[PDB]
Design an enzyme around this catalytic site. Structure first.
Site, short mmCIF file in Angstrom:
data_model
loop_
_atom_site.label_atom_id
_atom_site.label_comp_id
_atom_site.label_asym_id
_atom_site.label_seq_id
_atom_site.Cartn_x
_atom_site.Cartn_y
_atom_site.Cartn_z
N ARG A 131 0.94 -1.09 -0.14
CA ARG A 131 0.04 -0.05 0.00
C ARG A 131 1.01 1.42 -0.21
O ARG A 131 0.49 2.31 -0.69
CB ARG A 131 -0.97 -0.02 1.26
CG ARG A 131 -2.17 1.09 1.33
CD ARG A 131 -2.73 0.99 2.53
NE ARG A 131 -3.29 2.52 2.74
CZ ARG A 131 -3.52 3.03 3.79
NH1 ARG A 131 -3.04 2.70 5.13
NH2 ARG A 131 -4.28 4.37 4.03
N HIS A 183 0.54 4.13 -3.04
CA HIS A 183 0.13 5.38 -2.50
C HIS A 183 1.38 6.43 -3.14
O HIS A 183 1.11 7.47 -3.18
CB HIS A 183 -0.50 5.44 -1.26
CG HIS A 183 -1.66 5.30 -1.13
ND1 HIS A 183 -2.59 5.69 -0.02
CD2 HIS A 183 -2.60 4.79 -1.95
CE1 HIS A 183 -3.86 5.11 -0.32
NE2 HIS A 183 -3.80 4.70 -1.56
N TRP A 186 -10.34 -8.79 2.64
CA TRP A 186 -11.33 -9.04 1.39
C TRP A 186 -11.14 -10.67 1.31
O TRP A 186 -12.11 -11.25 0.52
CB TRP A 186 -10.52 -8.58 0.17
CG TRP A 186 -10.58 -6.96 0.11
CD1 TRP A 186 -11.36 -6.29 -0.22
CD2 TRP A 186 -9.60 -6.12 0.72
NE1 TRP A 186 -11.34 -5.00 -0.44
CE2 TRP A 186 -10.23 -4.80 0.39
CE3 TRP A 186 -8.28 -6.08 1.40
CZ2 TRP A 186 -9.56 -3.52 0.75
CZ3 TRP A 186 -7.71 -4.82 1.68
CH2 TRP A 186 -8.37 -3.60 1.49
C1 HEM Z 1 -9.89 1.92 -6.47
C2 HEM Z 1 -8.84 1.97 -6.07
C3 HEM Z 1 -8.37 1.78 -4.76
C4 HEM Z 1 -9.15 2.03 -3.69
C5 HEM Z 1 -10.37 2.93 -3.39
C6 HEM Z 1 -8.37 1.23 -2.32
C7 HEM Z 1 -8.88 1.62 -1.07
C8 HEM Z 1 -8.08 0.92 -0.05
C9 HEM Z 1 -8.60 1.09 1.42
C10 HEM Z 1 -10.05 1.81 1.81
C11 HEM Z 1 -7.93 0.27 2.05
C12 HEM Z 1 -7.90 -0.03 3.53
C13 HEM Z 1 -6.72 0.92 4.38
C14 HEM Z 1 -6.52 0.72 5.67
O1 HEM Z 1 -7.65 0.84 6.57
O2 HEM Z 1 -5.61 0.46 6.27
C15 HEM Z 1 -6.72 -0.31 1.17
C16 HEM Z 1 -6.04 -1.11 1.88
C17 HEM Z 1 -5.06 -1.67 0.95
N1 HEM Z 1 -4.49 -1.38 -0.67
FE1 HEM Z 1 -6.17 -0.49 -1.68
N2 HEM Z 1 -7.38 0.79 -2.78
C18 HEM Z 1 -7.14 0.74 -4.38
C19 HEM Z 1 -6.43 0.18 -5.18
C20 HEM Z 1 -5.32 -0.31 -4.63
C21 HEM Z 1 -4.14 -0.76 -5.39
C22 HEM Z 1 -3.99 -0.45 -6.86
C23 HEM Z 1 -3.06 -1.39 -4.45
C24 HEM Z 1 -1.92 -1.96 -5.00
C25 HEM Z 1 -1.34 -2.48 -6.24
C26 HEM Z 1 -3.80 -1.28 -3.26
C27 HEM Z 1 -3.15 -2.14 -2.22
C28 HEM Z 1 -3.56 -2.29 -0.90
C29 HEM Z 1 -3.30 -3.24 0.13
C30 HEM Z 1 -1.99 -4.05 0.07
C31 HEM Z 1 -3.97 -2.72 1.42
C32 HEM Z 1 -3.97 -3.40 2.70
C33 HEM Z 1 -3.06 -2.67 3.48
C34 HEM Z 1 -2.83 -3.24 4.72
O3 HEM Z 1 -3.27 -4.40 5.18
O4 HEM Z 1 -2.22 -2.52 5.80
N3 HEM Z 1 -4.81 -0.86 -3.46
N4 HEM Z 1 -7.28 0.06 0.04
CA LIG Z 2 4.64 10.65 -4.22
#
Ligand code: HEM
Ligand SMILES: [Ca+2]
Ligand SMILES: [K+]
Length: 267
Positions: free
Chosen positions: A31, A35, A175
Protein backbone atom coordinates in the site's frame (compact mmCIF):
# COMPACT_ATOMS: atom_id res chain seq x y z
CA UNK A 1 22.58 -6.69 -15.05
CA UNK A 2 23.87 -3.52 -13.28
CA UNK A 3 24.75 -4.01 -9.65
CA UNK A 4 23.35 -1.30 -7.39
CA UNK A 5 25.69 0.33 -4.84
CA UNK A 6 23.72 -1.21 -1.93
CA UNK A 7 23.89 -4.91 -1.10
CA UNK A 8 20.56 -5.87 -2.65
CA UNK A 9 20.77 -9.61 -1.80
CA UNK A 10 21.33 -8.82 1.91
CA UNK A 11 18.65 -6.12 1.86
CA UNK A 12 16.01 -8.45 0.33
CA UNK A 13 16.76 -11.00 3.09
CA UNK A 14 16.49 -8.37 5.82
CA UNK A 15 13.12 -7.29 4.42
CA UNK A 16 11.87 -10.89 4.40
CA UNK A 17 13.03 -11.27 8.04
CA UNK A 18 11.25 -8.07 9.04
CA UNK A 19 8.04 -9.31 7.44
CA UNK A 20 8.45 -12.76 9.08
CA UNK A 21 8.28 -10.99 12.47
CA UNK A 22 5.18 -8.96 11.54
CA UNK A 23 3.24 -10.51 8.64
CA UNK A 24 0.76 -7.61 8.51
CA UNK A 25 3.62 -5.38 7.40
CA UNK A 26 3.69 -7.15 4.00
CA UNK A 27 0.38 -5.70 2.74
CA UNK A 28 1.13 -2.24 4.23
CA UNK A 29 4.43 -2.09 2.28
CA UNK A 30 2.51 -2.72 -0.90
CA UNK A 31 0.00 0.00 0.00
CA UNK A 32 2.89 2.37 0.76
CA UNK A 33 4.59 1.92 -2.64
CA UNK A 34 1.26 2.20 -4.43
CA UNK A 35 0.26 5.43 -2.70
CA UNK A 36 3.73 6.92 -3.28
CA UNK A 37 3.09 6.28 -7.03
CA UNK A 38 -0.64 7.20 -6.98
CA UNK A 39 0.07 10.92 -6.64
CA UNK A 40 0.98 11.07 -10.40
CA UNK A 41 -0.96 12.96 -13.07
CA UNK A 42 0.24 11.80 -16.48
CA UNK A 43 -1.29 14.80 -18.31
CA UNK A 44 0.21 17.47 -15.98
CA UNK A 45 3.32 15.29 -15.53
CA UNK A 46 3.35 16.25 -11.85
CA UNK A 47 2.76 14.87 -8.34
CA UNK A 48 6.28 13.42 -7.79
CA UNK A 49 5.45 9.74 -7.94
CA UNK A 50 8.01 7.17 -6.82
CA UNK A 51 10.20 9.78 -5.09
CA UNK A 52 9.31 9.02 -1.44
CA UNK A 53 7.59 12.47 -1.52
CA UNK A 54 5.09 11.09 1.06
CA UNK A 55 7.85 11.62 3.66
CA UNK A 56 6.80 15.30 3.54
CA UNK A 57 3.83 17.20 4.81
CA UNK A 58 1.21 17.85 3.34
CA UNK A 59 1.24 14.54 1.43
CA UNK A 60 1.82 12.38 4.55
CA UNK A 61 -1.32 13.94 6.08
CA UNK A 62 -3.71 13.33 3.17
CA UNK A 63 -6.59 11.16 4.42
CA UNK A 64 -5.81 8.48 1.82
CA UNK A 65 -2.35 7.97 3.35
CA UNK A 66 -3.48 7.49 6.96
CA UNK A 67 -1.61 4.66 8.69
CA UNK A 68 1.24 4.64 6.17
CA UNK A 69 3.60 6.01 8.82
CA UNK A 70 3.79 2.39 10.13
CA UNK A 71 5.51 0.87 7.07
CA UNK A 72 7.63 4.06 6.57
CA UNK A 73 8.88 3.80 10.16
CA UNK A 74 9.68 0.08 9.81
CA UNK A 75 11.76 0.77 6.72
CA UNK A 76 13.89 3.41 8.53
CA UNK A 77 15.96 0.72 10.25
CA UNK A 78 16.88 -0.71 6.91
CA UNK A 79 17.71 2.72 5.44
CA UNK A 80 20.17 3.20 8.31
CA UNK A 81 21.81 -0.19 7.57
CA UNK A 82 21.80 0.39 3.75
CA UNK A 83 22.55 4.10 3.40
CA UNK A 84 23.26 3.94 -0.33
CA UNK A 85 19.64 3.06 -1.29
CA UNK A 86 17.17 5.95 -1.74
CA UNK A 87 13.93 5.85 0.28
CA UNK A 88 12.10 5.73 -3.04
CA UNK A 89 13.92 2.56 -4.19
CA UNK A 90 13.63 1.05 -0.70
CA UNK A 91 9.85 1.49 -0.63
CA UNK A 92 9.49 -0.06 -4.07
CA UNK A 93 11.87 -2.95 -3.36
CA UNK A 94 10.14 -3.73 -0.05
CA UNK A 95 6.78 -3.91 -1.88
CA UNK A 96 8.29 -6.26 -4.47
CA UNK A 97 9.81 -8.38 -1.70
CA UNK A 98 6.42 -8.47 0.10
CA UNK A 99 4.55 -9.52 -3.04
CA UNK A 100 6.90 -12.44 -3.72
CA UNK A 101 7.05 -13.43 -0.03
CA UNK A 102 3.25 -13.77 0.13
CA UNK A 103 3.37 -16.06 -2.92
CA UNK A 104 2.89 -13.44 -5.69
CA UNK A 105 4.98 -12.83 -8.86
CA UNK A 106 8.71 -12.02 -8.75
CA UNK A 107 8.70 -8.58 -10.40
CA UNK A 108 11.90 -7.43 -12.16
CA UNK A 109 13.27 -4.54 -10.15
CA UNK A 110 14.96 -1.42 -11.52
CA UNK A 111 16.90 0.87 -9.18
CA UNK A 112 17.90 4.54 -9.25
CA UNK A 113 14.84 6.49 -8.11
CA UNK A 114 15.88 9.83 -6.62
CA UNK A 115 14.29 11.05 -3.40
CA UNK A 116 12.31 14.26 -3.25
CA UNK A 117 14.49 16.86 -1.46
CA UNK A 118 11.62 19.00 -0.13
CA UNK A 119 7.78 19.10 -0.04
CA UNK A 120 7.40 21.71 -2.82
CA UNK A 121 7.25 18.85 -5.37
CA UNK A 122 4.17 17.32 -3.64
CA UNK A 123 0.97 17.27 -5.63
CA UNK A 124 -2.41 18.28 -4.21
CA UNK A 125 -4.80 16.19 -2.15
CA UNK A 126 -7.57 14.38 -4.00
CA UNK A 127 -5.26 12.27 -6.20
CA UNK A 128 -5.79 9.05 -4.21
CA UNK A 129 -8.89 6.98 -4.88
CA UNK A 130 -11.85 6.96 -2.49
CA UNK A 131 -13.26 3.55 -1.57
CA UNK A 132 -16.76 4.97 -1.07
CA UNK A 133 -17.04 5.83 -4.77
CA UNK A 134 -17.57 3.62 -7.79
CA UNK A 135 -16.52 3.12 -11.40
CA UNK A 136 -16.88 6.66 -12.73
CA UNK A 137 -14.43 7.78 -9.99
CA UNK A 138 -12.12 4.71 -10.25
CA UNK A 139 -11.80 5.13 -14.03
CA UNK A 140 -11.07 8.87 -13.64
CA UNK A 141 -8.20 8.16 -11.23
CA UNK A 142 -6.68 5.34 -13.22
CA UNK A 143 -6.93 7.26 -16.50
CA UNK A 144 -5.16 10.16 -14.71
CA UNK A 145 -2.37 7.75 -13.84
CA UNK A 146 -2.10 6.50 -17.44
CA UNK A 147 -3.61 3.00 -16.99
CA UNK A 148 -6.16 1.19 -19.13
CA UNK A 149 -9.13 -0.82 -17.80
CA UNK A 150 -7.19 -4.14 -17.90
CA UNK A 151 -4.35 -2.66 -15.83
CA UNK A 152 -6.81 -0.98 -13.39
CA UNK A 153 -8.49 -4.25 -12.57
CA UNK A 154 -5.20 -6.19 -12.25
CA UNK A 155 -3.79 -3.60 -9.81
CA UNK A 156 -6.89 -3.50 -7.55
CA UNK A 157 -6.32 -7.26 -7.30
CA UNK A 158 -3.73 -6.48 -4.61
CA UNK A 159 -6.67 -6.46 -2.20
CA UNK A 160 -6.09 -10.18 -2.25
CA UNK A 161 -3.94 -9.38 0.75
CA UNK A 162 -4.16 -7.21 3.86
CA UNK A 163 -7.23 -5.67 5.42
CA UNK A 164 -8.99 -2.45 6.25
CA UNK A 165 -8.55 -0.75 9.62
CA UNK A 166 -11.27 1.44 11.16
CA UNK A 167 -8.67 3.88 12.52
CA UNK A 168 -7.11 4.44 9.04
CA UNK A 169 -9.88 4.32 6.42
CA UNK A 170 -13.07 3.74 8.46
CA UNK A 171 -13.55 0.37 6.85
CA UNK A 172 -13.01 -2.95 8.57
CA UNK A 173 -11.69 -6.41 7.67
CA UNK A 174 -9.86 -8.50 5.06
CA UNK A 175 -11.12 -9.13 1.51
CA UNK A 176 -10.17 -12.81 1.40
CA UNK A 177 -9.78 -15.84 3.67
CA UNK A 178 -6.04 -15.70 3.53
CA UNK A 179 -4.98 -12.06 3.93
CA UNK A 180 -1.36 -13.23 3.90
CA UNK A 181 -1.59 -14.86 0.46
CA UNK A 182 -1.03 -13.11 -2.86
CA UNK A 183 -3.09 -14.66 -5.68
CA UNK A 184 -6.31 -14.15 -7.69
CA UNK A 185 -8.62 -14.84 -4.74
CA UNK A 186 -9.90 -11.23 -4.58
CA UNK A 187 -11.51 -11.81 -8.00
CA UNK A 188 -12.72 -15.29 -7.07
CA UNK A 189 -14.45 -13.91 -3.95
CA UNK A 190 -15.80 -10.85 -5.77
CA UNK A 191 -17.40 -13.08 -8.46
CA UNK A 192 -18.43 -16.11 -6.42
CA UNK A 193 -19.93 -14.65 -3.25
CA UNK A 194 -23.23 -12.98 -2.54
CA UNK A 195 -22.27 -9.49 -1.31
CA UNK A 196 -24.70 -8.15 1.32
CA UNK A 197 -24.85 -4.95 3.30
CA UNK A 198 -22.74 -5.08 6.47
CA UNK A 199 -25.16 -3.83 9.18
CA UNK A 200 -22.51 -2.87 11.75
CA UNK A 201 -19.91 -0.76 9.95
CA UNK A 202 -20.88 2.88 9.82
CA UNK A 203 -19.07 3.51 6.51
CA UNK A 204 -20.98 1.44 3.94
CA UNK A 205 -19.27 -1.84 3.03
CA UNK A 206 -20.35 -5.29 1.88
CA UNK A 207 -19.79 -8.71 3.44
CA UNK A 208 -20.15 -12.23 2.06
CA UNK A 209 -23.42 -13.99 2.88
CA UNK A 210 -21.62 -17.34 3.24
CA UNK A 211 -19.36 -16.54 6.25
CA UNK A 212 -19.70 -12.74 6.82
CA UNK A 213 -15.93 -12.64 7.47
CA UNK A 214 -14.93 -11.11 4.13
CA UNK A 215 -15.44 -7.53 2.91
CA UNK A 216 -15.72 -5.52 -0.29
CA UNK A 217 -15.70 -1.72 -0.68
CA UNK A 218 -18.04 0.14 -3.08
CA UNK A 219 -14.91 0.68 -5.24
CA UNK A 220 -14.26 -3.12 -5.29
CA UNK A 221 -17.80 -4.10 -6.31
CA UNK A 222 -17.88 -1.42 -9.03
CA UNK A 223 -15.48 -3.78 -10.91
CA UNK A 224 -18.46 -6.18 -11.17
CA UNK A 225 -21.01 -3.47 -12.02
CA UNK A 226 -19.04 -1.90 -14.86
CA UNK A 227 -19.19 -4.25 -17.92
CA UNK A 228 -15.68 -3.28 -19.11
CA UNK A 229 -14.13 -4.02 -15.73
CA UNK A 230 -16.18 -7.19 -15.20
CA UNK A 231 -14.51 -8.89 -18.19
CA UNK A 232 -11.14 -8.53 -16.42
CA UNK A 233 -12.49 -9.63 -13.05
CA UNK A 234 -13.70 -12.77 -14.84
CA UNK A 235 -10.38 -13.23 -16.68
CA UNK A 236 -8.37 -13.10 -13.45
CA UNK A 237 -10.82 -15.14 -11.33
CA UNK A 238 -10.41 -18.06 -13.80
CA UNK A 239 -6.70 -17.63 -14.55
CA UNK A 240 -4.28 -17.04 -11.71
CA UNK A 241 -1.27 -17.28 -14.01
CA UNK A 242 -2.62 -14.49 -16.21
CA UNK A 243 -3.33 -12.48 -13.01
CA UNK A 244 0.25 -12.91 -11.72
CA UNK A 245 1.67 -11.84 -15.10
CA UNK A 246 -0.64 -8.86 -15.55
CA UNK A 247 -0.25 -7.71 -11.98
CA UNK A 248 3.58 -7.90 -12.28
CA UNK A 249 3.58 -5.83 -15.44
CA UNK A 250 1.12 -3.20 -14.13
CA UNK A 251 2.75 -2.86 -10.72
CA UNK A 252 6.15 -2.51 -12.35
CA UNK A 253 4.64 0.18 -14.60
CA UNK A 254 3.07 1.89 -11.56
CA UNK A 255 6.33 1.99 -9.55
CA UNK A 256 8.18 3.34 -12.55
CA UNK A 257 5.79 6.22 -13.33
CA UNK A 258 7.47 9.58 -13.63
CA UNK A 259 10.93 8.03 -13.18
CA UNK A 260 14.12 8.49 -15.18
CA UNK A 261 17.56 6.98 -15.43
CA UNK A 262 16.68 3.63 -13.81
CA UNK A 263 18.92 0.50 -14.01
CA UNK A 264 18.03 -3.21 -14.14
CA UNK A 265 18.95 -4.99 -10.93
CA UNK A 266 20.33 -8.57 -11.00
CA UNK A 267 17.71 -11.33 -10.43
C1 HEM B 1 -9.99 1.97 -6.53
C2 HEM B 1 -8.71 1.95 -6.12
C3 HEM B 1 -8.39 1.65 -4.65
C4 HEM B 1 -9.11 1.96 -3.57
C5 HEM B 1 -10.37 2.86 -3.53
C6 HEM B 1 -8.45 1.40 -2.42
C7 HEM B 1 -8.82 1.52 -1.11
C8 HEM B 1 -8.24 0.95 0.00
C9 HEM B 1 -8.68 1.07 1.38
C10 HEM B 1 -9.90 1.89 1.88
C11 HEM B 1 -7.84 0.34 2.14
C12 HEM B 1 -7.84 0.16 3.67
C13 HEM B 1 -6.72 1.01 4.28
C14 HEM B 1 -6.66 0.74 5.78
O1 HEM B 1 -7.71 0.97 6.45
O2 HEM B 1 -5.60 0.32 6.32
C15 HEM B 1 -6.86 -0.26 1.26
C16 HEM B 1 -5.85 -1.11 1.67
C17 HEM B 1 -4.93 -1.73 0.87
N1 HEM B 1 -4.70 -1.43 -0.46
FE1 HEM B 1 -6.13 -0.47 -1.70
N2 HEM B 1 -7.36 0.68 -2.87
C18 HEM B 1 -7.29 0.81 -4.23
C19 HEM B 1 -6.32 0.27 -5.05
C20 HEM B 1 -5.20 -0.42 -4.60
C21 HEM B 1 -4.05 -0.78 -5.39
C22 HEM B 1 -3.93 -0.41 -6.89
C23 HEM B 1 -3.17 -1.43 -4.61
C24 HEM B 1 -1.79 -2.01 -4.98
C25 HEM B 1 -1.45 -2.41 -6.21
C26 HEM B 1 -3.74 -1.49 -3.29
C27 HEM B 1 -3.14 -2.14 -2.23
C28 HEM B 1 -3.64 -2.18 -0.95
C29 HEM B 1 -3.20 -3.10 0.06
C30 HEM B 1 -2.12 -4.19 -0.03
C31 HEM B 1 -4.04 -2.80 1.26
C32 HEM B 1 -3.94 -3.51 2.62
C33 HEM B 1 -3.09 -2.62 3.54
C34 HEM B 1 -2.87 -3.24 4.91
O3 HEM B 1 -3.23 -4.41 5.13
O4 HEM B 1 -2.28 -2.56 5.79
N3 HEM B 1 -4.98 -0.89 -3.31
N4 HEM B 1 -7.16 0.09 -0.04
CA1 LIG C 1 4.52 10.78 -4.23
K1 LIG D 1 -5.51 -13.90 -0.52
Amino acid sequence: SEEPPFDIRALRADIEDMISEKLELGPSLIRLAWHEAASYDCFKKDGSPNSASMRFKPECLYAGNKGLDIPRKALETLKKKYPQISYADLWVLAAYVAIEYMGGPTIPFCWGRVDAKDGSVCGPDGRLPDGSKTQSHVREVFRRLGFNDQETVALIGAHTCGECHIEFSGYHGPWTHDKNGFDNSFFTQLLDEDWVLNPKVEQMQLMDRATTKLMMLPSDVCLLLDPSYRKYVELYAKDNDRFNKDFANAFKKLTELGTRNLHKAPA
